[PDB]
Structures are given as structure tokens and as C-alpha cells.
């Protein structure tokens, strides 16, 4: 579902993608 279309990642998009892609810090928090 949707590849690396190098779409404009404006911080948040950049956040989700950062994850979708690799992940990041933890994203758990409430988990």
C-alpha cells in the first residue's frame, strides 16, 4: 500500500512516514 512516493512530509507526515518506514523513538506512550 503506497510506496516511497517521496511525498511531502511536513513534520507530522514526516513523523508517520518516519515510522511507517522505520519507526522512531517508541510511539508507545499510552501503549
Amino acid at each position: 500500500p503506497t510506496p516511497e512516493m517521496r511525498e511531502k512530509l511536513c513534520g507530522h507526515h514526516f513523523v508517520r512516514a518516519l515510522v511507517r518506514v522505520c519507526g522512531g523513538p517508541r510511539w508507545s506512550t499510552e501503549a
Partner: peptide, 26 residues
């Protein structure tokens, strides 16, 4: 090896899972 601010840089143009693959802390 690092670059500018990825958050800003991808905001204007965008970033591939490759960029993001190297922007993660893992």
C-alpha cells in the same frame, strides 16, 4: 553524512522510505 532539517526538507519536497529509513533513531 547528516543533512539539513528532515522535517522541514521533506515538508517542502518530501522524503522516501529511504530518507526516513536513515532518519529514524534505529
Amino acid at each position: 553524512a547528516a543533512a539539513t532539517n528532515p522535517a522541514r526538507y521533506c515538508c517542502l519536497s518530501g522524503c522516501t522510505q529511504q530518507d526516513l529509513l536513515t532518519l529514524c533513531p534505529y
